[PDB]
């Protein structure tokens, strides 16, 4: 099997800058008919791949002109003359000259924007959920950059651990921001045993850790 | 040109699953077709090729003997039969046109190989309460397998929506949240409804989210 090595694998780019993704093949990749069957696919967040380039440099009809291809033999390149916010996603190279067709790992393109602080919201559980015997309290961090953030839960100023879990969205294609939801799960008995519930958010956009709290009832 | 897959779902290991792909917008009888799958947290792996009339069928080595193809050019349809399913067969199965060009792809269908059972979701409001922007959402808890799709006001509300990726709870069930930020001055004016869909368990919830 031919191995396709992509480099770099993570590509944070300032908006508008050019970018280049390299694809290195383990074998010659020139087929017996003289053609080189090397493709480039773009998988934007939440979507299936879509072809960008076929045969090294031939661009598809539905692809913007700022995408181009180059190379020969074992070294190939996807070029983006100007990286737009909507170009965030994973870029794969693919070869079809050797059996079977194989893909590279994929290069995740990320827009490097200016820092934004997370708008923080906390949600007490729903009366319907407590009727069911469990309590989930949600902490929301909305439209922040960079991605790195730390959320800590405290019930009556008691640090929690092992009971919460968080989830972060892919980079937004419009404002290049992230969003994170951290859910703290407790039992209805444990929930109605304490009064103050808070999540503490530390982020680069905040000078000090911001805390959002509610008092049960 | 359109490609639509179906048939993906939860299947216990060793079980069987039949995937279908219906095509539109081109003379189906003229193109080779191919299947490509995408592992969880992973990239792409070619799976299968099929001839214009289905006389030639080729497969990736890791599935040789377990997968079989068929084609029905009278109904512009392509099929893939998955037998003796292993855990590593989990992933999104894409229907693609014309290998080795793969110029068009379907939206994909999810195959989850697991002994776990299908679970319906519990949909609970994430109410907003008391700056100039209110956040409100919906909690879709304790469901298996994936996917779940959330929309707001039947698609009429799109700006500000964030439907998070699911998380696997320690219970072995998924849970995600869909939030939307809206002007706080439109809480007693505009109605907000979250439209949850979990087709594996035939669940459809339209919950109005209101404050207090």
């Amino acid at each position: 099997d031919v191995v396709l090595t992509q480099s770099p694998l993570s590509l944070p780019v300032i908006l508008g800058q050019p970018a280049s993704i390299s694809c290195r093949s383990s074998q010659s990749l020139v087929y017996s008919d003289g053609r080189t069957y090397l493709n480039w696919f773009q998988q934007r967040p939440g979507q299936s791949p879509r072809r960008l380039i076929y045969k090294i440099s031939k661009r598809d009809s539905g692809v913007p002109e700022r995408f181009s291809g180059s190379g020969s033999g074992t070294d190939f390149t996807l070029e983006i003359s100007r990286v737009e916010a909507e170009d965030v996603g994973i870029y794969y190279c693919m070869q079809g000259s050797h059996w079977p067709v194989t893909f590279g790992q994929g290069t995740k393109v990320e827009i490097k924007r200016t820092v934004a602080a997370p708008s923080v919201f906390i949600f007490p559980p729903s009366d319907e959920q407590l009727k069911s015997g469990t309590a989930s309290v949600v902490c929301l961090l909305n439209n922040f950059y960079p991605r790195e953030a730390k959320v800590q839960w405290k019930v009556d100023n008691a640090l929690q651990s092992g009971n919460s879990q968080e989830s972060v969205t892919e980079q937004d294609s419009k404002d290049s921001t992230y969003s994170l939801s951290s859910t703290l799960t407790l039992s209805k008995a444990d929930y109605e045993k304490h009064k103050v519930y808070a999540c503490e958010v530390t982020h680069q956009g905040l000078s000090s850790p911001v805390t959002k709290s509610f008092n049960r009832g | 040109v359109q490609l639509v897959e179906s048939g993906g779902g939860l299947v216990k290991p060793g079980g069987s699953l039949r995937l279908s792909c219906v095509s539109s917008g081109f003379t189906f009888s003229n193109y080779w077709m191919s299947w490509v799958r995408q592992a969880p947290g992973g990239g792409l792996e070619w799976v299968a090729n099929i001839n214009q009339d289905g006389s030639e069928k080729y497969y990736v080595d890791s599935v040789k003997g377990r997968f079989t193809s068929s084609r029905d050019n009278t109904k512009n349809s392509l099929f893939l039969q998955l037998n003796s399913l292993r855990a590593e067969d989990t992933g999104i199965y894409y229907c693609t046109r014309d290998p080795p060009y793969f110029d068009n792809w379907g939206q994909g269908t999810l195959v989850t190989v697991s002994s776990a059972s299908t679970k319906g979701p519990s949909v609970f409001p994430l109410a907003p309460s008391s700056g100039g922007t209110a956040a409100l959402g919906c909690l879709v808890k304790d469901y298996f397998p994936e996917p779940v799709t959330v929309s707001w006001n039947s698609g009429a509300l799109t700006s500000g929506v964030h439907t998070f990726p699911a998380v696997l709870q320690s219970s072995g069930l998924y849970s995600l949240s869909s939030v939307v930020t809206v002007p706080s001055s439109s809480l007693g004016t505009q109605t907000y409804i979250c439209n949850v869909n979990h087709k594996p368990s035939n669940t459809k919830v339209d919950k109005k989210v209101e404050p207090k």
Binding site: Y31, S32, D33, G34, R35, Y37, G96, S97, W99, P100 | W32, N49, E56, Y58, P99, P100, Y101
Partner: peptide
Amino acid sequence: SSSGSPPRRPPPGR
């Protein structure tokens, strides 16, 4: 100088 013939079936001798 060859014309175009894309590879869609495995090579003989696998």
